[PDB]
Structure formats: C-alpha cells, structure tokens
C-alpha cells in the first residue's frame, strides 16, 4: 500500500522528467514515424542539414559524433537531476550530498536507460527521430569508436529482462540513492532511502512481473555491472582527455570525471 503509492510517485516523476521513455522507444523501433538511419558520412550530413536536426567548433567526423554524444548526455543529466529531486527525501540531503550522488550515479542511470533506445544494430538519437548504426560507430577512428560499443553489450543483455518504464523508474532511483559514493556526508540517510526504494522495487516486480522468478536479484547484479561499466568508461574518458588534447570535453563531464575512481 505504502509501497504501491511510493512506486507510483516515482513512476510519475519518471514520466514527468524524461522525454524519451522505453514505451516510446520500442514503439519507434518496432514501427507504429520511421527514424532517419545514420550509417555513414553522407547520411550523418543529411541528418544535420535539416531532418533529425550549439556545438564546439567543427573538427572532424569522429569528433562531431563525440560532441553530439556529449550534448545528449548533458541533457539527460539535467533530466536525471530533476527526477532525483522528486525522490522522497533526496531534496532533504545537503546540496553537496545531492551533487555527490548525481556525480557518481548519473552515468550508471544513463547507461541503464540507454538500453531502452538500443537494439543490436544501433540506437535512437535526436529524441528518436534518427537511428545511428552500431557499425557506423565501430567505423569511427579510435579512440572514439571504442566508447559506445561496450554499452551495446550490456544493453542487449539488460533488455532481455523485459522491464517497462514503471520498473525502470524505481531501478534508476535505487542507482542514484547509493550510500557508498565517495565523499557522501549522510550515509545512513541515503542508505535508508535506498532501502525504501529497493523494498518498493521488489513489491512492484512481483505485482508487475508475477511469473518472473529471480528478477529482483538479477537487477541487483545489474546495478553492480553498471558500476564497473562506468568505471571502465571513466578510464576511457580520462584517457581521451589526455590523448585527444584538441577535442573539447563538456565542462559538466569534466567535473563528473574529475578524480572519479
Ligand atoms: C561521449 C562521452 C559520453 O559517453 C557516452 C557513451 C555511450 C552512451 C552515452 C549517453 N547517450 C548517447 C547515445 C548516443 O549518442 C549519440 C548521439 C549522436 C550521434 O551521431 C550523430 C551518435 C551517438 C544516451 N542517449 C540516451 C537517450 C535516452 C536515455 C539515455 C541515453 O543515453 C554517453 C559520456 O561520458 O557522457
Ligand atoms: C551552465 C552551462 C554549463 C556549460 C558551461 C560552458 C559550456 C562550454 O561549451 C560547451 O562545450 C561542450 C563540448 O562538447 C559542448 O558540447 C557544449 O554544447 C558547449 O555548451
């Protein structure tokens, strides 16, 4: 009862704050308008010249994709921040504790939600109006071609669990409310909120996925998988900042990756 309403509150905060939902994504990816496919240089250009679509000064094809990728991340961080403010008691934390949770949590949540817009062949872009192929991303020059590929591997496995948006709302909330983030001041308070979230998640999963047996423990493992995925992503990003000294890294991403792990 308490948990059912708590889950509903989180769900509505999710629907309120995220422009792209899995319901919308799967509808686009299954055909019910069709996205413009971006599979090489020429189609990427066509996607820029109206159709589908501010950025740093143009450098090259691979850096351009890198820049558009960052812009989308920054926008999703804005959404996750507003979503977190609706998680009961998150706003009661001191401001720097809120930032600490978002700093170490947003990319874990981003990569979880990324699975919603992905299939084995590519992912939606531009609010679902475009589709960039996995192959085209593989064809970019290193190191940029190695950024997104490992996320496809996680996403395909994650999509096998067949979560819906109501499940994901609680899942993302549990990711953000994480008591072991470095520098967190009020660990007991954050652990207490997370426990409420996780209890609501188990209650919600058995009501929404009755025939799903080990779904809750599987999602706990997914949370651990996302932390290592992000650790390896932070390494790549920290490397690229050192290697690609002429490519711009958005200030928000610089701050997120600042001595992270
Ligand atoms: C770069 C540094 C960046 O790493 C990454 C690595 C992998 C994935 C992301 C986040 N992401 C980008 C998808 C593709 O992004 C494009 C965009 C345009 C394009 O070609 C024109 C090709 C790829 C995303 N979208 C979402 C939509 C809904 C929900 C969650 C979403 O998560 C960031 C970081 O560290 O933040
Ligand atoms: C309060 C606003 C936060 C941004 C402050 C400075 C923004 C500097 O410029 C940023 O560089 C990024 C590099 O990819 C671009 O992608 C961004 O679109 C651009 O705004």
Residue numbers in the entry: 173 to 204, 208 to 228, 234 to 441
The article reads:
Peroxisome proliferator-activated receptors (PPARs) belong to the nuclear receptor (NR) superfamily and ligand-activated transcription factors that sense intracellular free fatty acids. Three PPARs, similar to other NRs, comprise amino-terminal domains containing the activation function (AF)-1, DNA-binding domain, hinge region, and ligand-binding domain (LBD) containing the AF-2 region, and carboxyl-terminal domains. The ligand-induced AF-2 helix 12 formation, which recruits coactivators such as PGC1α and SRC1, is a hallmark of PPAR activation. We herein reveal five novel high-resolution structures of PPARδ/γ–bezafibrate, PPARγ–fenofibric acid, and PPARδ/γ–pemafibrate, thereby providing the molecular basis for their application beyond dyslipidemia treatment.
The PPARδ-LBD–pemafibrate cocrystals, similar to the PPARα-LBD–pemafibrate cocrystals (reprinted from Kamata et al.), were obtained without using coactivators, whereas the PPARγ-LBD–pemafibrate cocrystals were obtained only using SRC1, suggesting that its physical interaction with PPARγ-LBD is the weakest. The electron density of pemafibrate in PPARδ/γ-LBD indicated a single molecule in the protein monomer similar to that observed in PPARα-LBD. Their overall structures were identical to the active conformations that form the AF-2 helix 12 (arrowheads in Figure 6A,E,I), with RMS distances of 0.75 Å (234 common Cα positions in PPARα/δ) and 0.71 Å (226 common Cα positions in PPARα/γ). Pemafibrate was located at the almost identical Y-shaped structures comprising the Center and Arm II/III regions in all PPARs although its phenoxyalkyl group seemed to be pushed toward helix 5 in PPARδ-LBD and its 2-aminobenzoxazole group seemed to be pushed toward helix 3 in PPARγ-LBD. Hydrogen bonds between PPARα T279 and water molecules were also observed in PPARα, whereas a water-mediated hydrogen bond or electrostatic interaction with 2-aminobenzoxazole group of pemafibrate was observed in PPARδ-LBD. Pemafibrate was further stabilized by hydrophobic interactions in all PPARs. In PPARδ-LBD, bezafibrate was located at the Center/Arm II regions, where the potent PPARδ-selective agonists such as GW501516 and GW0742 bind, and only pemafibrate was located at the Arm III region as in PPARα-LBD. The concentrations at which pemafibrate (known as a selective PPAR modulator α “SPPARMα”) activated PPARα were three orders lower (107% efficacy and 1.40 nM EC50) than those at which it activated PPARδ (11.3% efficacy and 1.39 µM EC50) or PPARγ (119% efficacy and EC50 > 5 µM). Pemafibrate activated PPARα/δ/γ-LBD-mediated transactivation, PGC1α/SRC1 recruitment, increases in thermostability, and bound to PPARα/δ/γ-LBD with the similar Y-shaped forms, although it acted at much lower concentrations on PPARα-LBD than on PPARδ/γ-LBD.
